[PDB]
Amino acid sequence: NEYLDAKKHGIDLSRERAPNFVDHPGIPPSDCFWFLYKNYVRQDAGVCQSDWSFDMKIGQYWVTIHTDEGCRLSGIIPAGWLILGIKRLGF
């Protein structure tokens, strides 16, 4: 587990401030929040769709992030960075 490890450095996703985002008209709302940390410090946050994937630029690096049915995130991300997912509250 890597939530277990985050929790050692004081990261709790259940008590992070929600990302800034919009629910766009005409498409399903995103049901996952992602939080992005460098050397364990929050740099950014956003939303994504469960049981899916997205591409994101982290520093110099384009990365593919896989999002499983429970908003767990996986992918090869650059050294020093950590990305963590959780169900959007009420999803």
Binding site: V22, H24, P25, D44, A45, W52, S53, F54
Partner: protein, 78 residues
């Protein structure tokens, strides 16, 4: 049919420059919707099909000095 959610990061540090970016993005062909995102509100997400993103990034890069694509997610239907 397929639609993309595309996040562009740009130099927007106030409501005025954020507003200008949203208006410019809203006028681009294929843009169905646009919203501010990011911990520093330095990102806009556009949603649509047939968006000329190269052109949209070019127009924003001219207006704001720095703009680049930083996230692409396909819309997951239903």
């Amino acid at each position: 049919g397929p639609k993309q959610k595309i996040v562009i990061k740009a130099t927007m540090s106030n409501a005025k420059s954020r507003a200008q970016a949203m208006v410019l993005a809203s006028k681009a062909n294929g843009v169905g919707s646009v919203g501010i995102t990011g911990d520093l509100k330095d990102q806009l997400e556009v949603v649509g099909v047939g968006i000329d993103i190269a052109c949209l990034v070019r127009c924003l890069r001219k207006k704001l000095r720095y703009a680049e694509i930083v996230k692409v997610e396909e819309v997951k239907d239903k």
